[PDB]
Amino acid sequence: TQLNPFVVANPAKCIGCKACEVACFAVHNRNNHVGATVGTVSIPVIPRLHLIKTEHGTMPIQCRHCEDAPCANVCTVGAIKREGNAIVVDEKLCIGCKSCLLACPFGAIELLPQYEDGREVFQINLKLVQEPRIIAYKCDLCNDLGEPACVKACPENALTLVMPTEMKKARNKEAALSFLRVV
Amino acid sequence: TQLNPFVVANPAKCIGCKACEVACFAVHNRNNHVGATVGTVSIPVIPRLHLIKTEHGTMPIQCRHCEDAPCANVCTVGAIKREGNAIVVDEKLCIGCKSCLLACPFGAIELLPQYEDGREVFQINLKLVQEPRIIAYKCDLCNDLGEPACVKACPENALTLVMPTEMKKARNKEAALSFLRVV
Numbered sequence: 001t002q003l004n005p006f007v008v009a010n011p012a013k014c015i016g017c018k019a020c021e022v023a024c025f026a027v028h029n030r031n032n033h034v035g036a037t038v039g040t041v042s043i044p045v046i047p048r049l050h051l052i053k054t055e056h057g058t059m060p061i062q063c064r065h066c067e068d069a070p071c072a073n074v075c076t077v078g079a080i081k082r083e084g085n086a087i088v089v090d091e092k093l094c095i096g097c098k099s100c101l102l103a104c105p106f107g108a109i110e111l112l113p114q115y116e117d118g119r120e121v122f123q124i125n126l127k128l129v130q131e132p133r134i135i136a137y138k139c140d141l142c143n144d145l146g147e148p149a150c151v152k153a154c155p156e157n158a159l160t161l162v163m164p165t166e167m168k169k170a171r172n173k174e175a176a177l178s179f180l181r182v183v
Numbered sequence: 184t185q186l187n188p189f190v191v192a193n194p195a196k197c198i199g200c201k202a203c204e205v206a207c208f209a210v211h212n213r214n215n216h217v218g219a220t221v222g223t224v225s226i227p228v229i230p231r232l233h234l235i236k237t238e239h240g241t242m243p244i245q246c247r248h249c250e251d252a253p254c255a256n257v258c259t260v261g262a263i264k265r266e267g268n269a270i271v272v273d274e275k276l277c278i279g280c281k282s283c284l285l286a287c288p289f290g291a292i293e294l295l296p297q298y299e300d301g302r303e304v305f306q307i308n309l310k311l312v313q314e315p316r317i318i319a320y321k322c323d324l325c326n327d328l329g330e331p332a333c334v335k336a337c338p339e340n341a342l343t344l345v346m347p348t349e350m351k352k353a354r355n356k357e358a359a360l361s362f363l364r365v366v
């Protein structure tokens with residue numbers, strides 16, 4: 001078992017241009033007839049990270065991939081699993097219980113209607129107009145796909161994928177060098 | 184333990200040609216790519232003795248290498264130490280605490296930026312640009328190298344390296360011969 005890497009923003013180099021959300025929506029919805037052209041998208045837009053603005057600038061936030069994740073523990077059905085290096089949600093066993101929305105201190109999980117093959121997904125017996133199935137969305141760290149598209153789509157290069165082992169060693173070395181040069 | 188030598192000028196045979204400082208600068212900075220040729224000097228020039236000119240002529244002044252040296256005593260960090268026969272500053276531990284400039288009454292210590300391997304030496308955390316490291320420069324009587332270079336470069340042969348023991352004996356013998364020939 002190894003530390004889960006995660007993606008973190010940077011308030012000094014973010015402008016709220018929303019160029020990281022659309023790349024996420026394009027890359028994580030390849031099965032809904034998208035061809036890197038605006039106009040072929042016959043579905044509503046669903047990103048995985050979220051951009052929010054305060055008086056101290058604008059920043060996006062997303063799942064930090066906690067090891068002892070509250071969302072994994074609270075989920076009774078077992079949709080949330082640690083399949084790969086990052087914690088991922090399964091869209092087959094989700095039942096729509098809002099417990100995840102209580103579990104996450106950061107609120108990186110959203111509940112949105114599911115869209116497959118360019119058309120709205122419907123359930124069997126509900127209410128008379130039918131109701132669409134609701135699915136939890138969160139960042140998968142693009143394990144099935146290649147490199148993350150939230151990074152490399154930033155004009156100012158703000159979002160960074162960090163391994164929490166290298167920063168610790170680098171900061172330790174910097175602190176040791178700073179203290180050794182004076183004494 | 185014996186008296187330390189110190190170079191002294193001679194105002195009768197000094198002109199103000201500044202050809203004794205250049206030799207010192209060229210002999211101390213062998214690690215900054217100097218080849219006894221103007222053009223290979225890629226660093227600003229820093230001598231150790233300073234020429235001063237007033238109404239009654241001109242002369243150079245430098246460190247007299249005091250025994251109970253005020254500069255060594257006031258230095259809290261411990262940069263200035265009597266390592267050899269002469270008194271020498273240490274470039275590793277100096278922090279630029281300017282108390283030396285309040286200690287020496289002659290003023291043979293000057294604070295100037297350091298230059299190592301032909302480039303300016305910067306610090307770790309200061310100001311947004313960096314700032315150069317400042318070191319105290321003073322005469323070290325060429326202890327690491329051979330005989331003094333300010334002498335053997337003076338065209339008029341004004342600078343002399345005096346040992347304060349032989350000079351006293353010479354003056355005593357001169358006075359004794361002058362007085363004993365008359366009684």
Ligand code: SF4
Pocket residue numbers: 074075076077078079080089093094095096097098099100136
């Ligand atoms: S919303 Fe889905 S993943 Fe979250 S607890 Fe309910 S079933 Fe599990």
Ligand code: SF4
Pocket residue numbers: 062063064065066069070071072087103104105106107108109138
């Ligand atoms: S959804 Fe929230 S609680 Fe769950 S792993 Fe991500 S950041 Fe942690």
Ligand code: SF4
Pocket residue numbers: 023024025027028048049062138139140141142148149150151
């Ligand atoms: S890693 Fe993939 S799913 Fe996660 S925020 Fe980036 S683009 Fe979206």
Ligand code: SF4
Pocket residue numbers: 009013014015016017018019020021051060153154155156157158159
């Ligand atoms: S693409 Fe970069 S600069 Fe633009 S909103 Fe996203 S993180 Fe901020």
Ligand code: SF4
Pocket residue numbers: 257258259260261262263272276277278279280281282283319
């Ligand atoms: S300037 Fe350097 S040599 Fe002078 S007292 Fe301070 S540390 Fe010592």
Ligand code: SF4
Pocket residue numbers: 245246247248249252253254255270286287288289290291292321
């Ligand atoms: S720097 Fe000044 S006080 Fe210190 S030894 Fe030289 S002459 Fe004396």
Ligand code: SF4
Pocket residue numbers: 190206207231232245322323324325331332333334
């Ligand atoms: S004795 Fe040596 S170090 Fe001192 S001023 Fe002369 S050349 Fe420079």
Ligand code: SF4
Pocket residue numbers: 192196197198199200201202203204234243336337338339340341342
């Ligand atoms: S080289 Fe001799 S004459 Fe020329 S400035 Fe120096 S001490 Fe005076």
